[PDB]
């Protein structure tokens, strides 16, 4: 009675895009990130895609073709207990850990293990990857932030720091790492190394054990119910980086199958649909015959 809401709007509705209606792309950044300049005619443009989800971060490096996107290497967060990090899978420390694992696994796939060791001693400096003449050159890759807002302290930059210390030549600036002061233009490396090693959340565990044990028992439960203590965390990440750098080979799972399948309802056929309609017709005629007398 009020508005003329939807009569031909459904007929002239231009749909945006599948991925855009799902809410996973923007394409205003993808049209400039992905597409390679045409002077090279075949050269793939390698992009490190870092996606943050609840309980899991994803670090990949992929390029594009017309049929789709081809992924060269991929790392995850749920495989970190195989390398040592049992708990704390979605922090800045696991972001740096996953970036280092992705870089070491990519260079193990390419076979560039002995050269380009990167930054072994984790200090948090601006150690950019250089190219050695007479040898195969460095791996040029470019970031993917996605829909996440790039603020100082976002762990997509921690995955970037892991990639750079693993030995991936990615151009970046030092003013978006955590520890960069917003007013003063100087950058502090000790604060950044502290935030890599996760001493601030160790200080927060100390804060919870000193102030109120109720919150320390409410959250951080998996920590205290297997084991977490800050000296073992500071030794644990230090051992985990060496456990990455000694064996990035990505042993797989057989999985083969136990072939049994009934979960989802299939589609009903045209004759079944028309006979459902016919049963509705006959049942309504039976109701018109019966309830008008009864």
């Amino acid at each position: 009675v009020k508005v003329v809401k939807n009569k031909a709007y459904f007929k002239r509705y231009q749909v945006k895009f599948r991925r855009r209606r799902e809410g996973k792309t923007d394409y205003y950044a993808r049209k400039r990130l992905v597409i390679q300049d045409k002077n090279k005619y075949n050269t793939p443009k390698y992009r490190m895609i870092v996606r943050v989800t609840n309980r899991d971060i994803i670090c990949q490096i992929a390029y594009a073709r017309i049929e789709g996107d081809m992924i060269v290497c991929a790392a995850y967060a749920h495989e970190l207990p195989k390398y040592g990090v049992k708990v704390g899978l979605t922090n800045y420390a696991a972001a740096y850990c996953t970036g280092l694992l992705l870089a070491r696994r990519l260079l193990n796939r390419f076979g560039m293990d002995k050269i380009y060791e990167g930054q072994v001693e984790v200090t948090g400096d601006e150690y950019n990857v250089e190219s050695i003449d007479g040898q195969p050159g460095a791996f040029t890759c470019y970031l993917d932030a996605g829909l996440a807002r790039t603020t100082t302290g976002n762990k997509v930059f921690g995955a970037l720091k892991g990639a750079v210390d693993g030995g991936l030549s990615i151009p970046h600036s030092t003013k978006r790492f955590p520890g960069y002061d917003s007013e003063s233009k100087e950058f502090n490396a000790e604060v950044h190394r502290k935030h890599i090693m996760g001493q601030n959340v160790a200080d927060y565990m100390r804060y919870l054990m000193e102030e109120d044990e109720d919150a320390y028992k409410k959250q951080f439960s998996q920590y205290i119910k297997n084991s977490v203590t800050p000296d073992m965390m500071e030794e644990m990440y230090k051992k985990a980086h060496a456990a990455i750098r000694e064996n990035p080979v990505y042993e797989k799972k057989p999985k083969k199958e136990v072939k049994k399948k009934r979960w989802n309802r299939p589609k009903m056929s045209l004759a079944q649909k028309k006979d459902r309609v016919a049963q509705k017709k006959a049942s309504f005629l039976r109701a018109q015959e019966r309830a008008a007398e009864s």
Binding site: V277, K280, F284, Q288
Partner: protein, 208 residues
């Protein structure tokens, strides 16, 4: 008022009343139904319509005079509320006038030869219906005589046809009395709604 001998069969592109004209006067005709306007569908069975033969232009003043003559003959024949006449044709084409002598040669030659909007005519295709009258079964000859009286007033040669359809709807009069009672057609004032089978089931539940 120039004669209709100088405004005749189509020679120009259609020039309707729009954003670009802005100077056309009002058309002569305004209404189109003269009989029982609130009539139902089952009241007047038959209809006769007036088919053009020549690809011509009909003027709104000729439509005015023809609907007045047809209305007068209908109210003399079958009285008030015994018929329903509809002028199917609607005027939209706007003719132009290049007037002069405004007895001298000293005003303007053919300097600016663009016309001011004079009147409104209607371009008629061959076979396009001019008028349609729906009446009772006993008023078959009176519709023929009314359209015959309008034939002498419209220009050109045009014919008459009593339609096979049930009045203004596009459905046949033979299938009308056999099909409006059982399943499909429901009367909607003077119009007829045709329901398909590809509807929601709630309409069929509200029916029957």
């Amino acid at each position: 008022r120039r004669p209709a001998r100088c405004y005749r069969y189509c020679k120009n592109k259609p020039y309707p009343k729009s954003r670009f004209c802005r100077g056309v006067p009002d058309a002569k005709i305004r209404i189109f139904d003269l009989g029982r306007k609130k009539a139902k569908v089952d009241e007047f069975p038959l209809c006769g319509h007036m088919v053009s033969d020549e690809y011509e232009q009909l003027s709104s003043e000729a439509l005015e005079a023809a609907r007045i003559c047809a209305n007068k003959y209908m109210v003399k024949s079958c009285g008030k509320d015994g018929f329903h006449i509809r002028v199917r044709l609607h005027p939209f084409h706007v003719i132009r006038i290049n007037k002069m002598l405004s007895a001298d040669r000293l005003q303007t030659g053919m300097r600016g030869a663009f016309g001011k909007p004079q009147g409104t005519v209607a371009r008629v295709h061959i076979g396009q219906v001019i008028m349609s009258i729906r009446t009772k079964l006993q008023n078959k000859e009176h519709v023929i005589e009314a359209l015959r009286r309008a034939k002498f007033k419209f220009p050109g040669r045009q014919k008459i046809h009593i339609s096979k359809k049930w009045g203004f709807t596009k459905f046949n009069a033979d299938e009308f009395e056999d099909m409006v009672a059982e399943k499909r057609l429901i009367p909607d004032g003077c119009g007829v709604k045709y329901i398909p089978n590809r509807g929601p089931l709630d309409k069929w539940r509200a029916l029957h």
